[PDB]
């Protein structure tokens, strides 16, 4: 009793279900709450991290000892082909939180979209929305589709936009779109909505939502490490060498008189594949890649104002376990949640 | 004891007239208006008579601790009637040691930015309650004048300056710095 030497906690109780996330895409818990004084824009965005390289920058921090000198810094580059806005969803709040009022999809939807709405593309007859596209085309539902905008505009309060990645531009095996639902923090809710009515099934790059040196947040799903016990999952101390029944355990998992094991205590279970939300990553360089066909292919990436070589950001022989970066990208200071070839969602 | 009744009498001069929507008191005078609602205190207010405007607040049975609050009614009404014919000029005088405190007003007579208090890099924005007025007194060193109708809001304004310029972690018997109030007076002097 009375430990005789105070020790801090092992692990955090704020992440207590050390448990597989219910999801594969990084769900955004809370978009930044809209102030309509700003011009109309998005917040969140989908992107696939590829690998890491590093960088040399002229640091500029007057007051520090680092200043005016070359620093190497770890970056991570994230391949972001442009999204396609397909749907609009309006929410109305209740006294029980936001309730999804109603949805509007696109006029015609692409091919990798419908592959998300099925668990097996081969066996299926690819029949999604084939009785939905008639009410954009025939007039009979078409005057009650604009009813669904007129009653959208009056009642709903925060509108969100169903958009997804383009998998045709990505070197993986997957070919399922990652469909999302991202919030416009625009002005008045008519003009917050009159911006997204313009642009169903039209592409949106990253350099409109994000810019150079805009500090964003990363939401994504962590490493798959497996099923690992106490001193590995929670980093509790190994026992001394003499110990019968095991070196690698925690020993005392409770008192007597609470005759019941607490939740606070560390014990064996599943390590990794958790959902996490990284905060305050800095964008360094918005990249554009592999332009038009007249100049038959100009590559020209990895080009500062001082290295100045017709290069490409993928390394000499492709990234390890990724593929080959062909698209627009985002590069970010430091290490970022998730394995290679794994979707992670960005956020202002 | 539960005494039968108690009553004060409040006279109103002729250039100010008081109307009520119930317990709420609306006072309008020469230099504006101000109003106070007494929606919590449970005592009737009685205007009586034309040409003269005698006010007579009277409280019936009551316990003694509710008997004590009826004088508080007439002592708050006679700081609106005076506050709408005269208003309250508060003269706070700055005292300083080796460092001279310097002070400005930015927003129209409502915001006060105090600097070089005792030797800080830190400035102090003392935003006032809406309805009072700033004034730096001239023909006098470092005197700050606060005006307005409502004696709560003027003294609430005059407290947030005296309480912001406080020396901490030191002797406060000595190290006498600050912006202390010195005199609460009238705007229309002697009327």
């Amino acid at each position: 009793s009375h430990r005789k030497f105070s020790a801090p906690r092992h692990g955090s109780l704020g992440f207590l279900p050390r448990k597989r996330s219910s999801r594969h895409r990084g769900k955004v818990k809370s978009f930044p709450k809209d102030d309509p004084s700003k011009p109309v824009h998005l917040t969140a965005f989908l992107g696939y991290k590829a690998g890491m390289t590093h960088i040399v920058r002229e640091v500029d921090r007057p007051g520090s000892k680092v200043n005016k000198k070359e620093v190497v810094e770890a970056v991570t580059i994230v391949e972001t082909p442009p999204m396609v806005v397909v749907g609009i969803v309006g929410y109305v709040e209740t006294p029980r939180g936001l309730r999804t009022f109603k949805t509007v999809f696109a006029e015609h939807i692409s091919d990798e979209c419908k592959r998300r709405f099925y668990k097996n593309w081969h066996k299926s007859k690819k029949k999604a929305f084939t009785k939905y596209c008639k009410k954009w085309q025939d007039e009979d539902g078409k005057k009650q589709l604009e009813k669904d905008f007129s009653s959208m505009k009056k009642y709903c309060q925060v509108i969100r936009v169903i958009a997804h990645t383009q998998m045709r531009l990505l070197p993986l095996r997957q070919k399922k779109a990652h469909l999302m639902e991202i919030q416009v923090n625009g002005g008045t809710v008519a003009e917050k909505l009159d911006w997204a009515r313009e642009r169903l099934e039209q592409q949106v790059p990253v350099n409109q939502v994000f810019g150079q040196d805009e500090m964003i947040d990363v939401i994504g799903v962590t490493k798959g490490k497996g099923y690992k016990g106490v001193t590995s999952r929670w980093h509790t101390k190994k026992l001394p060498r003499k110990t019968h029944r095991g070196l690698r355990k925690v020993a005392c998992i409770g008192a007597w008189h609470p005759a019941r094991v607490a939740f606070s205590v560390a014990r064996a279970g599943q390590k990794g594949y958790h959902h996490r939300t990284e905060i305050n990553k800095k964008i360094y360089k918005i990249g554009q890649g592999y332009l038009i066909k007249d100049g038959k292919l100009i590559k020209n990436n990895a080009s500062t104002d001082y290295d100045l070589s017709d290069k490409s950001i993928n390394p000499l022989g492709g990234f390890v376990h990724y593929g080959e970066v062909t698209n627009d990208f985002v590069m970010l200071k430091g290490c970022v949640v998730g394995t290679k070839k794994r979707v992670l969602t960005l956020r202002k | 004891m539960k005494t039968i009744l108690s009553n004060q009498t409040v006279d109103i001069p002729e250039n100010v007239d008081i109307t009520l929507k119930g317990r709420t008191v609306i006072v309008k005078g020469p230099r504006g208006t101000l109003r106070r609602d007494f929606n919590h205190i449970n005592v009737e207010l009685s205007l009586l008579g034309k040409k003269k405007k005698r006010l007579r607040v009277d409280k019936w049975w009551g316990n003694r601790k509710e008997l004590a609050t009826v004088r508080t009614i007439c002592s708050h009404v006679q700081n609106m009637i005076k506050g709408v014919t005269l208003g309250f000029r508060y003269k706070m005088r700055s005292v300083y040691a080796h460092f001279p405190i310097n002070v400005v007003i930015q927003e129209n007579g409502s915001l006060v930015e105090i600097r070089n208090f005792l030797g800080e890099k830190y400035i102090r924005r003392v935003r006032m309650r809406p309805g009072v007025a700033c004034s730096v007194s001239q023909a006098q060193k470092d005197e700050l004048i606060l005006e307005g109708n409502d004696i709560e809001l003027v003294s609430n304004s005059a407290a947030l300056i005296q309480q912001a310029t406080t020396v901490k972690n030191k002797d406060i018997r000595k190290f006498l710095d600050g912006i202390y109030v010195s005199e609460k007076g009238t705007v229309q002097q002697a009327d």
Binding site: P95, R96, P258, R260, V261, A262, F263 | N42, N63
Partner: protein
Amino acid sequence: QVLVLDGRGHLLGRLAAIVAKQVLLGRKVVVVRCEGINISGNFYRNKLKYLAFLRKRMNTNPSRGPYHFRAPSRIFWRTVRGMLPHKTKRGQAALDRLKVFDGIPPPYDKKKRMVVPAALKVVRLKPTRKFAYLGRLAHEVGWKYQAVTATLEEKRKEKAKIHYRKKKQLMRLRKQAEKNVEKKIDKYTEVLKTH
């Protein structure tokens, strides 16, 4: 069939006692606008004894154990659950009738609400003593949907004031209609017999 209790202006236990008996007799009550429920005593006392309830927590996992609700909908509800024999099935089924609602919902806004004079703030407190709201302490503890109910309190009160506009308009004429002729042969049987 159903009775509807307007909830404002009442005390907590002095109303919830009466509901707990009327729901044990096979009736169906719906308490509406349970935000303006009062509670006797000053506010900071009624906030201490609800933070004292929040420190009650079982020390092996709180996910089982005392479920501290926060909305004043489910605060009045957990009080009434205290006054019914919920561990037996006769007290389980006396919760299949009480449907507390906060704000005034659209199934229950267009009914003539009934109030309880046996539980009001006017009657039961001595007027010189201090009283809290169930609404604003639930604002202090976790119920973060306060203003988006007071946004909807006025948006119902806006459309209700326009009904009273035209209910008295459909009542102002029938006083003018009874100023017309040939009814007084049938006023004769009612003025004699309590019109």
